[PDB]
Amino acid sequence: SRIINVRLISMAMTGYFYTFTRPRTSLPMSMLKYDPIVRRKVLFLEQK
Amino acid sequence: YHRLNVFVLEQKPGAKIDGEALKKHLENRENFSLKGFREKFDLEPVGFNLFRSEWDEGTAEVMERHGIPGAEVEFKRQKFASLKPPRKARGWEAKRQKPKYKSLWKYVKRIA
Amino acid sequence: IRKGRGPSSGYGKTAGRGTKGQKAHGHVKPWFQGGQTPLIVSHGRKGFVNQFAADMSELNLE
RNA sequence: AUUCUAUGAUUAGUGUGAACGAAAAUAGAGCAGCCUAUUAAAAUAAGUAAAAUGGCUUUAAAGCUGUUUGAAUAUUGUGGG
RNA sequence: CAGUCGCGUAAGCGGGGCAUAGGAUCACAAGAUACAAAAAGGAAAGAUCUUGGAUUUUUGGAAAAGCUACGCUAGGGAUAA
Ligand SMILES: [K+]
Ligand SMILES: [Mg+2]
Ligand SMILES: [Mg+2]
Ligand SMILES: [Mg+2]
Ligand SMILES: [Mg+2]
Ligand SMILES: [Mg+2]
Ligand SMILES: [Mg+2]
Ligand SMILES: [Mg+2]
Ligand SMILES: [Mg+2]
Ligand SMILES: [Mg+2]
Ligand SMILES: [Mg+2]
Ligand SMILES: [Mg+2]
Ligand SMILES: [Mg+2]
Ligand SMILES: [Mg+2]
Ligand SMILES: [Mg+2]
């Protein structure tokens, strides 16, 4: 319960996502990742 | 990429290389060796600079203007195949891949 | 090969079965691997078979 | 049209598995159509079709069914699949 | 190898952690792929890729408590008095 699996959704609206683990008592994750659908690095934000 | 090494060597006092002896060193030499060229004429390397060069969009035409051969040649990485000799597949599902066990192909075929 | 017809035939008294095992008394199911789960289960069956695709007779210009 | 045999088919498909398992079509055996049925019957079918629910069968369809409810009128496109 | 990002003067390094201790299928759920779509147009239910939830701890993965001195059968002396 201490750890949760979150989903980082591509802001290019392509439907690609990454999954990472982070503690519950932590701010949501936000990273700059590569999207293989558009083949470029875009912004990924946590789902919820 | 190729390394183009620019060397600047110093001649000893009052040692003027002959114009012909210099042009004869390159007459029948395909693998130029700075090590041998240095000891023969008793030179001393003092200066140096470097720049690289690789295949580009203009490499083809440049060879045509100056009539350089080899532009119609490409280099592919040499492949080293496995050194292990072929063997027979092992396992319950691998032994039963032939028509003999056609009644058991529901367990041996289309396996994820 | 007529089994169980004397020792000098090479197939007598056991018929090439061994000594008192399941393979001698009865029969072992063909899909049985001793209990280990088969790959078709641990991996699953991949894909589907197309039941609507047309079967064409292939003819080459050769 | 029905019936019997084989193929289709250790198939489609169902099932966690073990296993279970069609039809179209094909071939053969026979062949027969009718209501004026070669034995004496219909004024063309309503608590029926169908639905919900509990089951059977089964591939979720179709088919059988207890309980509670409950349609339409023919290709001038009415009803079932 | 391709794609495209970071750091670095540069050469170059980077597909987590100095190394050695976290289980599948099935089912279910969330995204993508445009494959097939049982007359036809759609869809449903399927297929492929990515991902998630397991003392499945008898951890290659059953939902599972005892008595028999009333006891029975097949075996072992492969383990006792
Ligand atoms: K229907
Ligand atoms: Mg012998
Ligand atoms: Mg034998
Ligand atoms: Mg033999
Ligand atoms: Mg014996
Ligand atoms: Mg044996
Ligand atoms: Mg099947
Ligand atoms: Mg009628
Ligand atoms: Mg009814
Ligand atoms: Mg029905
Ligand atoms: Mg009906
Ligand atoms: Mg259709
Ligand atoms: Mg085990
Ligand atoms: Mg192991
Ligand atoms: Mg007593």
UniProtKB/Swiss-Prot annotation, chain A:
GO cellular component terms given for this protein: mitochondrion; ribonucleoprotein complex; ribosome
GO MF annotations, alphabetized: structural constituent of ribosome
Disulfide bond entries: none
Subcellular location(s) of the protein: Mitochondrion
Family designation: Belongs to the bacterial ribosomal protein bL33 family.
Subunit structure: Component of the mitochondrial large ribosomal subunit (mt-LSU). Mature N.crassa 74S mitochondrial ribosomes consist of a small (37S) and a large (54S) subunit. The 37S small subunit contains a 16S ribosomal RNA (16S mt-rRNA) and 32 different proteins. The 54S large subunit contains a 23S rRNA (23S mt-rRNA) and 42 different proteins. bL33m stabilizes the tRNA acceptor stem in the E-site.
Protein's name according to its UniProt entry: Large ribosomal subunit protein bL33m
Gene designation: mrpl39
Residues of the full protein shown: 7 to 54 of 59
Curated annotation (Swiss-Prot), chain B:
Cellular compartment(s): Mitochondrion
Source domain of life: Eukaryota
Family: Belongs to the phosphatidylethanolamine-binding protein family. Mitochondrion-specific ribosomal protein mL38 subfamily.
Subunit structure, interactors included: Component of the mitochondrial large ribosomal subunit (mt-LSU). Mature N.crassa 74S mitochondrial ribosomes consist of a small (37S) and a large (54S) subunit. The 37S small subunit contains a 16S ribosomal RNA (16S mt-rRNA) and 32 different proteins. The 54S large subunit contains a 23S rRNA (23S mt-rRNA) and 42 different proteins.
Described purpose of this protein according to its UniProt entry: Component of the mitochondrial ribosome (mitoribosome), a dedicated translation machinery responsible for the synthesis of mitochondrial genome-encoded proteins, including at least some of the essential transmembrane subunits of the mitochondrial respiratory chain. The mitoribosomes are attached to the mitochondrial inner membrane and translation products are cotranslationally integrated into the membrane.
Protein name (database record): Large ribosomal subunit protein mL38
Organism (species): Neurospora crassa (strain ATCC 24698 / 74-OR23-1A / CBS 708.71 / DSM 1257 / FGSC 987)
Lineage, opening ranks: Eukaryota, Fungi, Dikarya, Ascomycota, Pezizomycotina
Gene: mrpl35
